[PDB]
């Protein structure tokens, strides 16, 4: 597992270190949306920060289940329950929690065990998937992941009202890749001196 940049928003020079974790905080209690991202490993997005995403770049096709572990880095006094859902292909980005919960999901309860693992089971029509891109190759999309507030981030007086979550992603034991190719990017502009 390597850190998954779910919060791939900040591009500022001083704010690069904050793409490594996303916020969670006290809400209004209406199952608010927390974060969202495509589950596609070899696609431009959050997975590009992971070792898995990088190694994928060297192979045309992959197959297997993926897993994402979320670690809560709030304080010991902070409590809460989240609902991480995985929406297989065809399902548009769920508009609300009541829609997201209809797919593969897991209700996460914060406690002594800081992390929880969302397994993105291999649910495909084809035996292998080529890298998904916008357009026609979106045929190989894996689906969407979305974190919702099951209940709410609760905290006492004296404890921070905002905490962060760090997502770590990797592949399962049934993961396989085939057909070597070059990564989409070449880290060089002019001749290297």
């Amino acid at each position: 597992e390597t850190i998954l940049e779910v919060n791939n928003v900040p591009t500022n020079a001083t704010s690069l270190m904050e793409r490594l974790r996303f916020p969670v905080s006290a809400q209004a209690g209406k199952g608010e949306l927390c974060a969202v991202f495509r589950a596609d490993p070899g696609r431009d997005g959050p997975w590009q920060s992971t070792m898995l995403g990088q190694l994928c770049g060297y192979y045309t096709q992959w197959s297997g289940s993926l897993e994402v572990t979320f670690m809560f880095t709030g304080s010991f006094m902070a409590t809460g329950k989240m609902l991480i859902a995985y929406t297989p292909p065809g399902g548009p980005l769920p508009k609300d929690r009541a829609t997201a919960m209809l797919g593969t999901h897991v209700i996460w309860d914060f406690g002594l065990q800081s992390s929880v693992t969302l397994v993105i089971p291999w649910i495909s029509n084809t035996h292998y998937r080529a890298h998904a891109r916008d357009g026609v190759f979106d045929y190989y999309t894996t689906g969407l992941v979305s974190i919702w507030y099951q209940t709410n981030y609760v905290v006492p007086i004296g404890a921070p009202n905002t905490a962060y979550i760090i997502a770590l992603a990797a592949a399962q034991k049934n993961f396989t890749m085939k057909l070597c190719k070059d990564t989409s990017h070449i880290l060089q502009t002019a001749s290297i001196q």
Binding site: A26, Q27, G29, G31, M77, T79, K81, M101, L102, I107, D109, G111, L112, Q150, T151, N152, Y153, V154, V155, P156, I157, G158, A159
Partner: protein, 244 residues
């Protein structure tokens, strides 16, 4: 004994501050006998697709809350595959595993009474004076998944004392002790099967007997979430989908 896990269908509930499990009237949900039945058509027992945990809306516990209630066959009639079967079939039958969850901190305090009241018929204040024979509206007798709030909890909005509500399968959520209540209810009715639309076998009552309290600075938002799972669901008398 303080920790527990409830797995049914493709859903799992976890808890580390439980207070055992109550089995209403000492009976586990079961299917209908061949001698207790009348409907001759073979029923549908969808199993895993309907016997799983459904999490309904969340309520906010305030220092001034009075309490809420949910009628049961009802709360689920418009949710998941259970709802579809309840709409397509005339007859329905099933037990339930109710798990009310509410956590706070070691510095918050309060006690909720979580009880199951069979045939929970709602009454009205009768125009205040008691001379007007008014009746509770559909929105109040069958509130759906959003539940409904009690206006006069002392009499359970039905002219009966809440102090005796403990003669019914119940459990308490005392913040200094546990953060959830689990009650398993068997199918209770004078008939082997009945309509999931017209009849509500029982009602779930969550009422604050000891007010919530804490010092300013501790998180003020304390939710109460209701999760419930049907058990041994059976449906019969198939036709088109009916909403009510």
């Amino acid at each position: 004994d303080r920790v527990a896990q409830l797995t049914i269908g493709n859903s799992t509930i976890t808890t580390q501050e439980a207070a055992n499990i109550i089995v209403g009237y000492g009976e586990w949900p079961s299917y209908c006998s061949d001698d207790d039945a009348t409907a001759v058509d073979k029923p549908t027992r969808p199993d895993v697709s309907v016997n799983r945990f459904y999490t309904l809306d969340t309520k906010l516990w305030e220092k001034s809350s009075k309490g809420w209630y949910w009628k049961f066959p009802d709360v689920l009639t418009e949710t998941g595959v259970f709802g579809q079967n309840a709409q397509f079939h005339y007859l329905y039958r099933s037990g339930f595993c109710i798990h009310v969850q509410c956590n706070a901190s070691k510095f918050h305090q309060g006690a909720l009474l979580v009880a199951i009241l069979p045939e929970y018929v709602i009454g009205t204040v009768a125009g205040g004076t008691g001379t007007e024979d008014s009746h509770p509206p559909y929105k109040q007798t069958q509130p759906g998944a959003d539940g409904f709030e009690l206006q006069h909890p002392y009499v359970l909005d039905a002219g009966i004392p809440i102090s005796q509500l403990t003669v019914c399968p119940h459990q308490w959520i005392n913040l200094r002790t546990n953060n959830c209540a689990t009650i398993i209810v068997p199918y209770m009715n004078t008939l082997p099967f009945d309509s999931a639309l017209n009849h509500c076998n029982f009602g779930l009552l969550v009422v604050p007997i000891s007010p919530l309290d804490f010092d300013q600075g501790a998180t003020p938002v304390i939710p109460i979430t209701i999760t419930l799972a049907p058990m041994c669901s059976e449906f019969a008398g198939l036709r088109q989908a009916v909403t009510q």
